[PDB]
Design a protein around this ligand. Structure first.
Ligand SMILES: CCO/N=C/c1ccc(OCC[C@@H](C)CCN2CCN(c3ccncc3)C2=O)cc1
Ligand SMILES: CCO/N=C/c1ccc(OCC[C@@H](C)CCN2CCN(c3ccncc3)C2=O)cc1
Ligand SMILES: [Cl-]
Ligand code: NA
Ligand code: NA
Ligand code: NA
Ligand code: NA
Ligand code: NA
Ligand code: NA
Lengths: 58, 297, 245, 242, 49, 242, 99, 49, 58, 48
């Protein structure tokens, strides 16, 4: 399928696998995406990271 | 050229946003490793310092003796597309006969999905969202009856002439996209791209849309951001005479190819208006169920 | 070695001997806008040291009955120093921030403040109490300037949302028995590469007591909370005459 | 034309059907996506962020709502007295409803994983004390005394420099997944009870407050996952939204 | 025109023809006419066991 | 036949749907296409051609319409007096409506790019003068005096052999694209103001006219593009066209 | 006077930064602009009327009766193209009957 | 669209027809199947008991 | 697809990519076309072209 | 608020009993003569 690259996720780190019948990419199905996740971005955004076994404040 | 030392050794200008963390693949839940009794001095996983601002890093293995568990529970159903790509009601348009609202055979719907709690509360979990969408239009009489009526739906982007009547010249629709369909036919359905002028729509805009003194009169525009206003959706019975039947069009939206940024606390007070987070002050309720005492279930 | 720190930027230096590490919002440092993301064509001005420095803007008093306050960025600096001037002369602005909330007491005082950053912090009104009046918050409340504004209903952050979930945002706590300051680095957050420092507040800073201040008759009762902050990687474009709003 | 034959399902509109629909704007290209901090890829990322747990969900008048955010501890009489209790069921009405985990949990029929609650002491630096926090797996009634509670999974917390401690509510279930528990036959999916007791006593010297508070933060461990999307039990709207 | 909706344990059961629950923002719903052929869908193995 | 199942959208007629339709004249071959000068391939080609900008859009009676096509300049009193002003918003009501750029712009919801206006002096050869033309980016009010206007992007034009000068209205926007601006919240997409001032003065010798005119031509730069087709705001028809 | 548009560019009129512009020009091609179906004719087949009370009607193929479409095509002098015609029929109330 | 033509049988619901139906829960993954004694594969196994 | 070459754009400089199910080419979709453009044809049709930095009239 | 606009240090009392304010050399001339009231205030260093 050689179409237009106008999907909202064009140029996204997560790899999508979809189906489509029109020249416009956004008309495609939602499909399946990559299952990567980065919890630390929200749960552990400290400058100097501390280990599980250490005393957090030293 | 640059010759003075401070300029050579300057950092002014690097566009590379250095990131402290990166994403790893995680198709399934984490496994549990065997662990034994640890009676050490120095090592202390249980103790944390929440002031830092990070969540506890203590794990099952270090808090109790655990067995090995190969966890193959999938994490696929919690991806943004899995969560959002389910069509929900976002708008209703009424086309009554002898009524007050639209007794003229047509109707203009301002494209805003914030009129329904379910859908709204979900999207408001994030601040910025970028996505394509599939819209489905279900039409029938007020009793859920189906009649042989031909309808015309038209997307009127900002700047295009809004129809002022069932016979308005604007329905010539020479450039706007229109859809003609019968109530007997199945629900009309189309795909819509990400149309904002911004890189993402945003459910919250802490600001004003224009410069100048922001006196009382204009306080209605606080939080209003044009980048979120995609236009008008107009519908009309296709004729020069009044339709014989009253109609209702329910609009359903199904987001797809979704990306979101900046999570927010989830709404915990009833919604009152489309344009703002106003809540009923004399009725602030706790987020959940309450009990008589802290020592009793 | 994690409880002690020094922040130096511009001609300003901050020290603390009771810190609790540093938070880097959403895990990324402030950075100038790349040639790919940029859209405006004029060459920006990057004042550097004259504007990327620590400005100590306001002090509030913590009381056994305080509710909590909020300030808005960049609203707080729009009328201060060389930074303010640039914000006024230019249409477009973008920068990151290093926020340092200070509050010390004694080993006999107790209490905990939640210091957080909430992007696009839109304020709501109590809608006439009954919810039948479509009222809107006045300019003085949406953009309180350096004086900040006191929260009316902390539990819902004056916006119909639970403060209990505010920790999902970059934050730290000032627990008097542990630390006397919070430090949060924040990158530029917006859906556009640059924007108006005047019409748009990228985020809000919230300082709310979750565990009330307390002490015994005779201990110093005046416990201030001071707000210091520094823009980072400031960039401005679209020069013209100065405008205050 | 080509011989085809229509099957059941024809013309139906399934809201979760992932199909293809005709594009309304041919050759339209969307605005480029610039870099934006904090992109989230999976709801599980949010379930690992701690949010405040309203263990003290008793007061209800508007002026006292902020009190729900923390419970107290104070000098006792050394009889290993009870401090507080709460169900560990994350998707059930109660304390967990104040957490983002509990709220997100509301959009899924089933969940599986270990949870964790971190308690932060906010008393004065001169105050000390040891507490016993216990998790009682299913079947065990609310512990009569501390001696009983002690028989389950527990942590003995010592106040000090490190202001907090973490109780891990390990996944101990008969089934691989639990549906939201609630009174009735669905209590089959209950997780258990969490109870806090005075191990020793809250001690303080002359000059320091006799009462201090504890703030509880909760989230899920990395083996936590949810399945089967469903609408949340709340619909925050009474009439039409104007 | 009819609407069928699957309400899993924990989701709000509709209490009336006009219940807010029919917004069906997350539950799966099917809209179909009596004139259309029988609605038909596939259902996975959903037990926790 | 082959098992198929109809999905929503079936039977609908979308005016922008790009599909296949049965040909009415099998084996018909169209007349050969000979060479024709001036083929255009993309509307953007037309947006770079300058057309007259009606800066002087004030007179309205039929006999004075041609006057809208140019504004005057004449000997002043040397106080850096104001000559004319106009909004730079190309897709807004006003002067730009006379340009082909503004008209074509009317068929697109959004646009992005730098614009340019070239001013041609048509006074006598003996006349001289210096003007200050300035573009004031968003937020700046109409410049009180020349000193204020001077703070923005500007050009100081010197009359001479080269009859014209070009003011570039560089793309200075917060968003990558602007929608058509207009009074109300959509003023968020305003481009700004353009003002012309006497830098020195229009000087002329004995025997030459005291008043001459300037003609303004405008078009878009090569970074200009438009997106999202929409119908123009005008429909040049009142009743049926016979 | 020469008759050509100004060749002055942003870079030479002010100090500019570098901007990598990836805004597409696809939507302004002739097919993008014109390949959108619009009304070009109406035919009435009334019962007891004046115009066509005989059950048939002849329409002279001329699309210049409607402003929207007309103004668009009149932007050019010569045009060569294929076309897709769609015929929507119903009673004057927008009703559908077995005819 | 692609030229097709409907044949008899269209719209009928045959209870033994082994076809494909749209899934109601996209990306749903069922609980893992653990080992259970006594699995039967064919009714004939029972006819020999 | 081996059909009749009766499209209005047969023998055109701009390369089209379309879909069709009939023997007649004009029945095909509009598709995507080449994005070439020549502004100078209308904006700069001078016999002797002048540079941006020079004085147009010398 | 005004003082804060210049070169400064924010000192936090603690274990380390002291803090150091550096009065960096910010002068127009390479050398200053002793400053004093009058025209010689030209060589003033500033205020702390
Ligand atoms: C032939 C006609 O068919 N066209 C159908 C159609 C359907 C939807 C269309 O646009 C839908 C845009 C919505 C997905 C945008 C919803 N958003 C974006 C963010 N936003 C919003 C609302 C209130 N405050 C902040 C943001 C919204 O309401 C256009 C045309
Ligand atoms: C089985 C019957 O189906 N046939 C349908 C049909 C539709 C259209 C048909 O021809 C359409 C030709 C139009 C595209 C020509 C429009 N033009 C060409 C130029 N032109 C015109 C009008 C007025 N002044 C100058 C030019 C026009 O009105 C023929 C048959
Ligand atoms: Cl100042
Ligand atoms: Na479809
Ligand atoms: Na298409
Ligand atoms: Na067709
Ligand atoms: Na044929
Ligand atoms: Na089927
Ligand atoms: Na699916």
């Amino acid at each position: 399928s050689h179409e237009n690259s106008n999907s909202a996720t064009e140029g996204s780190t997560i790899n999508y696998t979809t189906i489509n019948y029109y020249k416009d990419s956004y008309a495609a199905t939602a499909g399946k995406q990559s299952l990567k996740q980065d919890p630390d971005k929200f749960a552990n955004p400290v400058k100097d990271i501390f280990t599980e076994m250490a005393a957090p404040l030293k | 050229g640059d010759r003075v030392a401070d300029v050579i050794e300057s950092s002014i200008g690097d566009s590379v946003s250095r990131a402290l963390t990166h994403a790893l693949p995680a198709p399934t839940g984490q496994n549990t490793q065997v662990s034994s009794h640890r009676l050490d001095t120095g090592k202390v996983p249980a103790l944390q310092a929440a002031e830092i601002g990070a969540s506890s890093n203590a794990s099952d293995e270090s808090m109790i003796e655990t067995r090995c568990v190969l966890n193959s529970h999938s994490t696929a159903e919690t991806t943004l597309d899995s969560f959002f790509s389910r069509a929900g009601l976002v708008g209703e348009i009424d086309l009554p006969l002898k009524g007050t609202t639209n007794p003229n055979g047509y109707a203009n719907w301002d494209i805003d999905i914030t009129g329904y709690a379910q859908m709204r509360r979900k999207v408001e979990l994030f601040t910025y969202m970028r996505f394509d969408a599939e819209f489905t239009f279900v039409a029938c009489t007020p009793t859920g009856e189906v009649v042989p009526q031909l309808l015309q739906y038209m997307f009127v982007p900002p700047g295009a002439p809004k129809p002022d009547s069932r016979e308005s010249l604007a329905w010539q629709t020479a450039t706007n996209p229109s859809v003609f369909v019968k109530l007997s036919d199945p629900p009309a359905q189309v795909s819509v791209p990400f149309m904002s002028p911004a890189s993402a729509y945003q459910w919250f805009y802490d600001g004003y849309p224009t410069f100048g003194e922001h006196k009382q009169e204009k306080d209605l525009e606080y939080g209003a951001c044009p980048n979120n206003m995609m236009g008008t959706f107009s519908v009309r019975t296709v004729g020069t005479s009044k339709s014989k039947y009253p109609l209702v069009v329910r609009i359903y939206m199904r987001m797809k190819h979704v990306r979101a940024w900046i999570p927010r606390p989830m709404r915990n007070q009833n919604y009152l208006f489309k344009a703002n987070p106003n809540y009923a002050g004399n009725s602030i309720k706790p987020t959940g169920a309450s009990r008589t005492a802290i020592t009793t279930l | 070695s994690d409880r002690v720190a020094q922040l130096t930027i511009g001609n300003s230096t901050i020290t603390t001997q009771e810190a609790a590490n540093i938070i880097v919002g959403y895990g990324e440092w402030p950075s100038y806008c790349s040639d790919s993301d940029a859209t405006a064509v004029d060459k920006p001005t990057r004042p550097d040291v004259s504007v990327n420095r620590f400005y100590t803007l306001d002090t509030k008093l913590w009381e056994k009955s305080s509710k909590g306050w909020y300030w808005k960025f960049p609203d707080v600096l729009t009328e201060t120093g060389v930074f303010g001037q640039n914000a006024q002369f230019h249409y477009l602005y973008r920068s990151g921030f290093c926020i340092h909330v200070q509050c010390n007491a004694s080993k006999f005082h107790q209490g905990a403040l939640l210091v957080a950053v909430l992007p696009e912090y839109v304020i709501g009104t109590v809608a006439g109490g009954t919810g039948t009046e479509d009222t809107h918050p006045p300019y003085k409340q949406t953009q309180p300037g350096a004086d900040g504004f006191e929260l009316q209903h902390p539990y819902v952050l004056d916006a119909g949302i639970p403060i209990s979930q505010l920790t999902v945002c970059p934050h730290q706590w000032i627990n008097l028995r542990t630390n006397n300051c919070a430090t949060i680095i924040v990158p530029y957050i917006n859906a556009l590469p640059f924007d108006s420092a005047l019409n748009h507040c990228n985020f809000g800073l919230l300082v709310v007591p979750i565990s009330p201040l307390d002490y015994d008759q005779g201990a110093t009762p005046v416990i201030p909370i001071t707000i210091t902050l520094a823009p980072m990687c400031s960039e401005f474009a679209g020069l013209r005459q100065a405008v205050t709003q | 034309g080509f011989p085809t034959e229509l099957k059941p399902g024809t013309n139906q509109f399934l809201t979760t059907d992932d199909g293809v629909s005709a594009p309304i704007l041919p050759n339209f290209h969307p605005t480029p996506c610039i870099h934006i901090p904090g992109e989230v890829r999976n709801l599980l990322e949010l379930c690992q962020v701690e949010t405040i747990l309203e263990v003290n969900n008793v007061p209800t008048n508007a002026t006292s709502l902020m009190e729900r955010l923390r419970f107290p501890v104070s000098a006792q009489a050394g009889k290993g007295e009870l401090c507080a209790v709460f169900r560990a069921d994350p998707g059930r009405n109660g304390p967990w409803q104040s957490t983002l985990l509990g709220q997100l949990c509301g959009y899924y029929t089933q969940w599986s994983g270990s949870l964790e609650v971190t308690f932060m002491f906010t008393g004065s630096f001169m105050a000390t004390g040891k507490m016993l926090i216990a998790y009682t797996p299913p079947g065990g009634p609310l512990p009569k005394d501390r001696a009983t509670a002690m028989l389950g999974t527990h942590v003995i917390w010592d106040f000090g420099l490190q202001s907090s401690v973490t109780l891990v509510i390990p996944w101990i279930s008969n089934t691989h997944y639990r549906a939201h528990a609630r009174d009735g036959v669905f209590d089959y999916y209950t997780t258990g009870l969490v109870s806090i007791w005075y191990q020793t006593n809250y001690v303080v010297p002359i000059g320091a407050p006799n009462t201090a508070y504890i703030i509880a933060l909760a989230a899920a461990q990395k083996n936590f996952t949810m399945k089967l999307c469903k609408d949340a039990s709340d619909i925050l709207q009474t009439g039409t939204i104007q």
